[PDB]
Structure formats: C-alpha cells, structure tokens
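User: Can you fold this complex?
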Amino acid sequence: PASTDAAAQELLRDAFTRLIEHVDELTDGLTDQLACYRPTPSANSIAWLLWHSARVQDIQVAHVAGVEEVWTRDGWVDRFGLDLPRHDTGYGHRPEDVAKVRAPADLLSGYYHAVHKLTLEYIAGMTADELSRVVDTSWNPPVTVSARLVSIVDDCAQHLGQAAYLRGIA
Amino acid sequence: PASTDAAAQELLRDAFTRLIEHVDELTDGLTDQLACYRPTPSANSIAWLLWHSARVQDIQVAHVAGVEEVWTRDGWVDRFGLDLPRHDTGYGHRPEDVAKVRAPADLLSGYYHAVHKLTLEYIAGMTADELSRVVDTSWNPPVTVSARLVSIVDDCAQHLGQAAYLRGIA
Ligand SMILES: [Cl-]
Ligand SMILES: [Cl-]
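Assistant: Here's the predicted assembly.
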C-alpha cells in the first residue's frame, strides 16, 4: 500500500456510493404493489431488480474479497424467506422466478446497505497491485480485480436504472 | 503526472468503455420502430436514451476537459438534423420532446463513438491532482473532477440500462 492509492480508493468509494443512494431513492415510499409491477408478463420487476443487484454485488465482492456473502453471514436469506434456493442470486432465474422475489422495501434497502458496508470495507484498502490481480482466468481477457469491480458497478447501475424507469410508470 | 496515476486511468478507461460496449449492443439491429417505442405515452424511448446519454457525456466531459463538444465540433448536430435547438442535450426535455429525437442507429452509434473518443483522450492523462480539482462550486459538497466523472458514468449507465430493458419489451 501507498498514499497514491487514495485516488483509486476514492473513485471506487464514490461509484459504489451512488448505487446505495439510488437504493435509498427507489425504496422510499415503495409499496408492495409497485415493487411487484411487471410492464409485460415476462419483464423484471422493481423488487427483483433491487434484490438481484444486491445479490450480484454481494457474491461478486465477497469473491474478490475472499469473504462470506452477507446474505448468509448475517441471516438475510432467512429474514427474506423467499421460496427459492438459499444460494440463488437471480443469475439463473426464469421469467416465472421473478414473481417469487417479494420483500418489504425496508428489507431490500437493509440488505443492500449491508452489502454496501461489505463493499466499502473491501475497496477502502485497494492497492495498485490488488487492482491488477487476476480473479477469473476462464475468460479472455482474464478478469482483473479492476475490471471485475467496474463490471459490478455497471451491472448494478443498469439494474437500478431499470428499476427507476419502472418506478416512474408502475 | 506520475506512474502511479495508471491505476485510476485504467478504472476510468474501463468504466467508460463499458458504456460504449452497451451502445454497440443496443444499436445492433435497432430499427426506427424499435428506437421510437414508448411503453406509456410519457415514457422515454431507446433513441432518446441513447442520444441523451451521448449528449450528457459530451457536454460534461467537454466541460471538465475545457474543450468543445463533439456535437458541434464535428457537425453531428447538423447530420442529425433534429427539430430541436442546436445546444439541446435533453436535460430540459418535456415528454413531448422525446418524440423529436429520431435518428438512425448508425448515427446514434457514431455520435456516441465520437464522444467516447473525446472521453478516452481526457481520462488518459488523469492525475491525482486533476481528480481532486473542483469543477462546480455551486453544489454542496463542491464537485470534484473525480465525483463528476463518476456522476457521468452512473447517469449514462442508468440510461443505457433503461434502453436495454426497453429493447427487450419493444
Ligand atoms: Cl439464481
Ligand atoms: Cl435540453
């Protein structure tokens, strides 16, 4: 570690903080009826997008950080009590599975806030060496930590943006 | 500038490159009918989201970089020929203005690619000092270059994510 790591630490902290800010916006005043709206029968809903975004960030950050997902570490999976396998992230969900993801806004927000805390703790000490470390050799180009973190922000930003679009028409 | 600037340069290059990759995906096989779909009468369309995202990135990057927007520099505004004021970005658009933003997919992609080139040229030499420079004193907290760049990526990622959602239901 070196003092010049602070710039990339700040870029990462700011990017991840925008995601949690969107979660606060999306969940404020979010009712169950709005959270479950689907504009067409196969389309993703707000609740699914909020939950999937949090799950994806949890599993992917926990992998690069080498820690347990908060979903199981703190029993969030049991507080949600969804009719789904315990490890599900939504990556494998069919259109019908979307309707199973139903939870109060406070639980969607609380789980994402716990994932955000986990993420802040990992990125806070990020070094140049860690950013260039490869975490996935199965893809070409092999995935560095830097690329994986950018992938997480982008995927979650897209899903949270979709949820905001739906919140305006639901 | 210093060699330790490379880490933040790479984070920025990768984040902005994901946006242009989404543009390539969204515009491939995009017809005029799909580009203009609105799921409800007031909702934003794919063409508007692609154009607005490019305009926002152009004006905001050009401001921090101290250069001219590519929209006017290379006459993109005239190639589009939209029935709108020449400086419009979409920030001021009413629901009815959305229907005026209609352009072939190749022009939407070409303009975003020119904005992406402008962005790559700016972020390529990013230094720690530049990242902490304030570009907007009117907000509290005052906006640093680092925060502004994160804001641009996030806003554009959200709009491009919304366009991808619409492409799947249009
Ligand atoms: Cl799954
Ligand atoms: Cl405008």
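The pocket of chloride ion (ligand 1) is lined by residues A 88-93 (CB under 6 Å). The longest strand of chain B covers residues 134-136.
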